[PDB]
């Protein structure tokens, strides 16, 4: 043969998925939004009451 | 500091025996005079 043509390189753009993780605990831990007046990185301590006895 | 009226519920009980036991409310006018005690017969033998 000896077809000494011109060589190329081909990188196809289909991905090989490797990572598939689950997060069960964060989907059960309930989310909260703190009622804070000003947006400050200062101590964000929000106090909430506890059920009375 | 910001208290936020978001109650952290902590306890939860149950009263099976008390909700199962029978309840009796005798007439108050007679039970005042009878010293808050009344008598009930027992099945005869």
Curated annotation (Swiss-Prot), chain B:
Changing residue 5 to A: Impaired phage growth; inability of the mutant capsid protein to interact properly with scaffolding protein. The record marks 5 as: Essential for binding to the capsid assembly scaffolding protein. It is found in: Virion. Coiled coil: none annotated. Residues 1-45 are annotated as: Binding to the capsid assembly scaffolding protein. Signal peptide: none annotated. Self-assembles to form an icosahedral capsid with a T=7 symmetry. Interacts (via N-terminus) with the capsid assembly scaffolding protein (via C-terminus); capsid proteins and scaffolding proteins form building blocks that assemble to form the procapsid. Interacts with the portal protein. Belongs to the P22 phage major capsid protein family. The insertion domain (I domain) plays an important role in the folding of the capsid protein by acting as an intramolecular chaperone. This is Major capsid protein. It comes from Salmonella phage P22. The lineage of its organism: Viruses, Duplodnaviria, Heunggongvirae, Uroviricota, Caudoviricetes. The chain holds residues 10 to 54 of 430 of the full protein.
């Amino acid at each position: 043969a000896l077809n000494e043509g011109q060589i190329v390189t081909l990188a196809v753009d289909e991905i090989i998925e490797t990572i598939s993780a689950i997060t069960p605990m964060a989907q059960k831990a309930k989310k909260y939004t703190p009622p804070a007046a000003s947006m400050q990185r200062s101590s964000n301590t929000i106090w909430m009451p506890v059920e009375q006895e």
